[PDB]
Ligand binder design. Structure first.
Ligand SMILES: [Mg+2]
Ligand SMILES: [Mg+2]
Ligand SMILES: [Mg+2]
Ligand SMILES: [Mg+2]
Ligand SMILES: [Mg+2]
Ligand SMILES: [Mg+2]
Ligand SMILES: [Mg+2]
Ligand SMILES: [Mg+2]
Ligand SMILES: [Mg+2]
Ligand SMILES: [Mg+2]
Ligand SMILES: [Mg+2]
Ligand SMILES: [Mg+2]
Ligand SMILES: [Mg+2]
Ligand SMILES: [Mg+2]
Ligand SMILES: [Mg+2]
Ligand SMILES: [Mg+2]
Lengths: 86, 370, 205
RNA sequence: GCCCGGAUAGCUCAGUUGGUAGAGCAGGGGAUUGAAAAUCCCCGUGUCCUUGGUUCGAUUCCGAGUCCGGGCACCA
RNA sequence: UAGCUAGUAGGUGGGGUAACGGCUCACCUAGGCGACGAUCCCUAGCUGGUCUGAGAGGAUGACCAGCCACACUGGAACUGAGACACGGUCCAGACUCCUACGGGAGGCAGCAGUGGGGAAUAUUGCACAAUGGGCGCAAGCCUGAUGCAGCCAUGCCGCGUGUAUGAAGAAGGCCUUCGGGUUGUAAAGUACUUUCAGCGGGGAGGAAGGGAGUAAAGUUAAUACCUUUGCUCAUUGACGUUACCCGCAGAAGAAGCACCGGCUAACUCCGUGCCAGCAGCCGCGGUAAUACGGAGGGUGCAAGCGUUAAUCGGAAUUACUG
RNA sequence: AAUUGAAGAGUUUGAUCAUGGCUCAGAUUGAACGCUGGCGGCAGGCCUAACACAUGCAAGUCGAACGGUAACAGGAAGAAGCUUGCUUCUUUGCUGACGAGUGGCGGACGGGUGAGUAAUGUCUGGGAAACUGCCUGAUGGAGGGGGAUAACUACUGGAAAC
């Protein structure tokens, strides 16, 4: 990085990246809980998982990490799956 | 053996002084004659001696001691080395800013080149020594007083003119020469550049400057580095009064300068000089340095900046050669019309490479037969 | 840009009078107008069709003082314009400011006129014109500025003009040293020896 | 930087610590044809890289500069 | 180059994407493309256009403008509205540089520039004054975009290089039926003019904005502040001895290249000798050469002219027109 | 008013007509070389090595986002040689401002080149499943808590890079 700005951006990017990864990773984990529940065949549990995670997903979307559409999609798929289950 | 016991500088210095005393005709007419006339010093091999300024400085102190001795003895070559010293060493010293040593040289020379005028302007200097010294101590008195009172502190003194420089002024001012005014000189040597400007203003409050005789050589230094203010005021009994204001540092440089009737000699990154013919290029230089270097020579820098390969090297300027790991000489370098290699040898070397890359019959046959 | 040389040689080569000399003293007495220029002038050449066209082109160019490229450009312009191409070209040639001046009678020859134009002698609508090729449009007045009115050369030119035939499309004043370009010169106004058609043909091969 | 070698008819080459230079081709000139090829005759047709030295006499031997071909050294 | 292709063609479901999608995974069906040329190979940025051409076409894609692609090579993501980012990150590679040898740094296909390659293509120029961009409330700062400047006849265009007169048809040049006739009114001489160049002076336009003071209106508790609209005040130029105008002296400083047998505009005079040379094609040159070299004379173009390369034309010689 | 445009020639032969090639006359260029060579205006200027790159500059800005002051110019409290009047040396972001930083926006534009790509290309025309900073028009919110983190300081690991 020859230009100060680039250097700043680079370090910022690194910092930003670390931040986002943590959030995104967490979100993924949350999703997996729901998915795991679905796989198991535990409906109440699945619902609980969804409840736990949906808000987080929404928050993430709001922040910008994940896109609004993407956030919606997870819910839809998850919603569909849970519905199917019971 | 000098070089073995006192390093390369001291031998370079000894050899330059020996050059420019060119004993050649130091003995050789023995009235000192090529001490005198370079007669192209050791040719233009003056222009293959070492440039180290300590050459000229030991040469000057050598000749100065000699002119002291050429007050006393051998008669008519008192005449000879005085003509050398006027025409060569005194104006050399002056364009170096060694004003002290110009003025001693010139006074010795002149007093055995023209004894009549030397003696006549010497005697004239006594004839008004008293009215001169009295008016100098009254001017220096007033200046010492008002400036000290204003809180400024500096040396303030009179300084005699030297006999050659009086002579000089007398025939570039004949019949408007004044034995009094023209032989007074006030100097002020101040602590700071600030105080030079201050002493200028106080001087000008005490005695009116003359129009057109105010000359700021601190703002525009002369080629031998000479810096001062000059002003001519209108003093209380001297309808001119000459005054030189400066700092200590600029007095030290003004009196002691540098001490503070074919080929082109190119410097190298360290300092080891290389000799090429006139009209040579970077490429040629590279080749001279090493043919492998030439082969691998990418780019030519001169004094930091890049230069075109076609542009010819000027004498003295410092070179740098940017180099590759593989050797790749162009066939364009051989072709002389582009102006890449003036030297024959370099060209030959270049050619050799191509032949190497490439890798009579009758005679052989004859030999076989034999 | 111009032909710096023997004026009458060109005329001789062509055959006809190109008006390259003033006409104070006649062309037939000055040069051997009948004979072609050079050692082999008396040797009458059996001229080819292309050759004749070329000659014609040269004549016209010579008359106006228009070098080849310029001439070509003019021709092209004419072609681009509507109507008879040769006629258009001729008009364009005429429209040249220097030519116009010459016609008026401020230049004895066209060369003189051109020179005058160059030397900021001529004004069009109260504005100086350095350029000889300047196309003088309809209803454009053309004059000499007061600094160049006092020239005897101009007077001489005027006199010559007076002696010679008058153009119809121009109006001119001798005392004031000015005039008016009324309209574009028709084919009937210009000389009939100029076969413009040949020229046109030559710029179609 | 240094050395070694080479520099000869148009052009291939021959001849060297010293005696006015040849072999091939090419060229000439003749007969002969329009001119040729063929055939038949007759013929060197040269700045020995220039300039100096040595010698009773230099292509050659010594310089001195050129030119080319090497083979060596050089690192700013 | 006639066969090609298993994520291959399609399906159900999952996953993914900003988005639809074999985009990817699981399982199933066995397709899909193809002689209206798939596949493989070679070459290629594509378009507006440019050149040429009567057109139709053919060739072509520098400059300017649109779209794509790429950024030392090969990847990869991250950040972000947007990138898988020329002057960001991460890795590997080859290549230069630094290193105390442990490890680092670097990326001109930005503008200059250097080397190299080449037949051949410019200066490490000044400036943000404009126009545009970035940021900011602005002032402003940055802007090698841009604007200008430098270099090169590379092109196009303009202009000039004198104009008028001028027979002794001077001299000299060349020819030569020996008279001249040609250079040629060409030159000299005389008169007249001063483009640009030279000097000295003046002298616009590109400058619209922005800044302070104010007065009114719009906001609000408020005549403050802010915004909007007027006004005077000084301002804002890199180019810049700018464009442009004037005065001075005096033709002064401003013509060359090709061609001249036929094609093809323009011809005479040598040396040589099928030699030297010419040449686009036909062909010139073997002792009288308008073709080779010179001289004069001419012809063509003209600050260019030629040669070469390259395209269309002519070539209806790929014919769609034809 | 807005394509108002179309030429042949030489050369096969003893000569002819025809087929038929080669070939010249034109226009042209990012051109080059040759011989020249006054100037201006407007243009154009690495087509090859997308070969290597020394040097400088080509993207910074915002202090009215935020703690802070690394240089500077002003005041403020204290004092030195005290020209009776402030020059001067110490302290404090209090201010005009600003080094370095965090943050924001910009570095995805602008500029370059044409290597790759005969189609996740281009042109033309159609579309549907999309996102879109700043600019924008509209309709509603902007409450109340946290813990971090550079910056800055001591002790240190590294030749540096860090
Ligand atoms: Mg789905
Ligand atoms: Mg080259
Ligand atoms: Mg022109
Ligand atoms: Mg699906
Ligand atoms: Mg390509
Ligand atoms: Mg056609
Ligand atoms: Mg990449
Ligand atoms: Mg993102
Ligand atoms: Mg770069
Ligand atoms: Mg004569
Ligand atoms: Mg002028
Ligand atoms: Mg003819
Ligand atoms: Mg010829
Ligand atoms: Mg055709
Ligand atoms: Mg030249
Ligand atoms: Mg700051």
């Amino acid at each position: 990085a020859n230009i100060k700005s680039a250097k700043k951006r680079a370090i910022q990017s690194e910092k930003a990246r670390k931040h986002n990864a943590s959030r995104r990773s967490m979100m993924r984990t949350f999703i997996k809980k729901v998915y795991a529940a679905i796989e198991a065949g535990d409906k109440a549990a699945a619902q609980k998982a969804f409840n736990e995670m949906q808000p987080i997903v929404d928050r993430q979307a709001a922040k910008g990490l994940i896109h609004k559409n993407k956030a919606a999609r997870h819910k839809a798929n998850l919603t569909a799956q849970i519905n199917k289950l019971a | 053996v000098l070089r073995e016991s006192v390093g390369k500088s001291v031998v370079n210095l000894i050899h330059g002084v020996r050059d420019m005393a060119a004993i050649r005709q130091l003995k050789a007419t023995h009235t000192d004659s090529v001490s005198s006339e370079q007669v192209d010093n050791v040719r233009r091999m003056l222009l293959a001696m070492v440039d180290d300024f300590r050459c000229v400085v030991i040469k000057l102190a050598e000749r100065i001691a000699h002119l002291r001795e050429v007050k006393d003895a051998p008669e008519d070559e008192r005449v000879l080395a005085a003509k050398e010293c006027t025409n060569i060493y005194a104006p050399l010293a002056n364009r170096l800013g060694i004003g002290q040593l110009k003025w001693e040289l010139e006074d010795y020379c002149f007093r055995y080149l023209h004894p009549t005028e030397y003696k006549r302007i010497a005697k004239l200097l006594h004839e008004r020594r008293l009215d001169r010294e009295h008016y100098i101590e009254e001017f220096v008195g007033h200046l010492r007083a008002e400036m000290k009172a204003e809180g400024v502190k500096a040396e303030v003194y009179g300084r005699p003119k030297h006999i050659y420089s009086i002579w000089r002024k007398m025939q570039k001012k004949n019949l408007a020469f004044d034995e009094l005014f023209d032989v007074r000189a006030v100097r002020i040597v101040a602590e700071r550049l600030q105080d030079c400007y201050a002493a200028l203003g106080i001087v000008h409050t005490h005695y009116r400057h003359l129009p057109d005789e105010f000359d700021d050589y601190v703002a525009n230094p002369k080629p031998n580095g000479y810096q001062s203010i000059h002003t001519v005021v209108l003093g209380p009994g001297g309808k001119t009064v000459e005054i030189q204001i400066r700092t200590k540092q600029m007095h030290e440089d003004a009196e002691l300068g540098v001490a503070a009737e074919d080929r082109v000699y190119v410097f190298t990154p360290k300092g080891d000089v290389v000799d090429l013919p006139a009209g040579s290029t970077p490429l040629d230089f590279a080749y001279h340095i090493h043919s492998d270097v030439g082969h691998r020579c990418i780019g030519a820098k001169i004094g930091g900046r890049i230069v075109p390969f076609t542009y010819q090297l000027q004498m003295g300027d410092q070179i740098e050669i940017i180099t590759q790991k593989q050797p790749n000489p162009s066939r364009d370098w051989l072709n002389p019309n582009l102006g890449y290699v003036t030297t024959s040898r370099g060209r030959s070397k270049i050619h050799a490479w191509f032949r190497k890359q490439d890798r009579a019959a009758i005679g052989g046959g004859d030999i076989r037969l034999n | 840009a111009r032909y710096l040389g023997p004026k009458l040689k060109l005329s001789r080569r062509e055959g006809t009078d190109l008006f390259l000399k003033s006409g104070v003293r006649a062309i037939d007495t000055k040069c051997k107008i009948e004979q072609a220029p050079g050692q082999h002038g008396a040797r009458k050449p059996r001229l080819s069709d292309y050759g004749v066209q070329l000659r014609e082109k040269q004549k016209v160019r010579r008359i106006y003082g228009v070098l080849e490229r310029q001439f070509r450009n003019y021709y092209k312009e004419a072609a681009r314009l509507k109507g008879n191409t040769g006629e258009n070209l001729l008009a364009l040639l005429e429209g040249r400011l220097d030519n116009v001046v010459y016609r008026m009678g401020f230049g004895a020859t066209r060369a003189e006129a051109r020179q005058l134009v160059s030397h900021k002698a001529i004004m069009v609508n109260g504005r100086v014109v350095n350029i000889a090729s300047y196309q003088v449009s309809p209803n454009d007045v053309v004059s000499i500025r007061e600094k160049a009115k006092k020239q005897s050369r101009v007077k001489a030119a005027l006199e010559l003009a007076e002696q010679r035939e008058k153009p119809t499309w121009l109006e001119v004043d001798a005392g004031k040293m000015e005039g008016t370009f009324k309209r574009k010169p028709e084919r009937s106004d210009l000389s009939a020896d100029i076969n413009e058609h040949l020229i046109v043909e030559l710029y179609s091969k």
